[PDB]
Amino acid sequence: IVGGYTCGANTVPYQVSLNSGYHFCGGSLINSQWVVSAAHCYKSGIQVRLGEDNINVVEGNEQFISASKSIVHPSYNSNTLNNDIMLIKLKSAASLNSRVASISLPTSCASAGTQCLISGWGNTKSSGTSYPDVLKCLKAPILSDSSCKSAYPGQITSNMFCAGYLEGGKDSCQGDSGGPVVCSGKLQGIVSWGSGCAQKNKPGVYTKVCNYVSWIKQTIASN
Numbered sequence: 001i002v003g004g005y006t007c008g009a010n011t012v013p014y015q016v017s018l019n020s021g022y023h024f025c026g027g028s029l030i031n032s033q034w035v036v037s038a039a040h041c042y043k044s045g046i047q048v049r050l051g052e053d054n055i056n057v058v059e060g061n062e063q064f065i066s067a068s069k070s071i072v073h074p075s076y077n078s079n080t081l082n083n084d085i086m087l088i089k090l091k092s093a094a095s096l097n098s099r100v101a102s103i104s105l106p107t108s109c110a111s112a113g114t115q116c117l118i119s120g121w122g123n124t125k126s127s128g129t130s131y132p133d134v135l136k137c138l139k140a141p142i143l144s145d146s147s148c149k150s151a152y153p154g155q156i157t158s159n160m161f162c163a164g165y166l167e168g169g170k171d172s173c174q175g176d177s178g179g180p181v182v183c184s185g186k187l188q189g190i191v192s193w194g195s196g197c198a199q200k201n202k203p204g205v206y207t208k209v210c211n212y213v214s215w216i217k218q219t220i221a222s223n
């Protein structure tokens, strides 16, 4: 997260860290055995780390659970990043409490102007790499589709939306990939892509979760 602030320990209880010997992506806990992340975060050997604040220190509240299976959306296109969503089933259920909680899936899509909270342990530099020890937060608004499409002509599908600032300086970045964009307590987006990070006129692009609610429910119901 570039230009964000320290969330505060466990203030984002649905945030998870996907780890393979280091933190490589974020995700959101949507129930005690399933996490939603981005398809471009796929790899084998994933350990999901819940209740984290400092990812380099065991401070208490952490629960480390291995992923039993990862389900990349069948129509995921790694070249356009269309359908950039993945579901991870945990080997055992997480113990939910005030520090580890699930976030609700939306019933309707959010409108341009809705203010959302994006969080993660991704890079904090737009120029350079600095990855933080504790979770970073950023409040950002969903932009209009005309603004999004004007910034990324021909690259925005109906399964994406832009959120952020056009002046630059505040954005999610690599490492934040797969993490949550929560608006009015509903998970509306997944950190997906953008041209660099926090560059002017190049807002972040997010997977539009409202378009996948039935796919998520059906998939979870059959696995």
Ligand SMILES: NC(=[NH2+])c1ccc2nc(-c3ccccc3O)[nH]c2c1
Binding pocket: 040, 171, 172, 173, 174, 175, 176, 177, 191, 192, 193, 194, 195, 196, 197, 198, 203, 204, 205
């Ligand atoms: N600016 C942004 N909002 C953004 C967010 C997530 C990203 N994840 C990447 C990314 C780029 C190349 C290879 C792996 C990545 O996870 N770039 C990103 C950019």
Ligand SMILES: [Ca+2]
Binding pocket: 052, 053, 054, 055, 056, 057, 058, 059, 060, 062
């Ligand atoms: Ca920790």
Ligand SMILES: [Zn+2]
Binding pocket: 040, 173, 174, 175, 176, 177, 178, 192
């Ligand atoms: Zn990424």
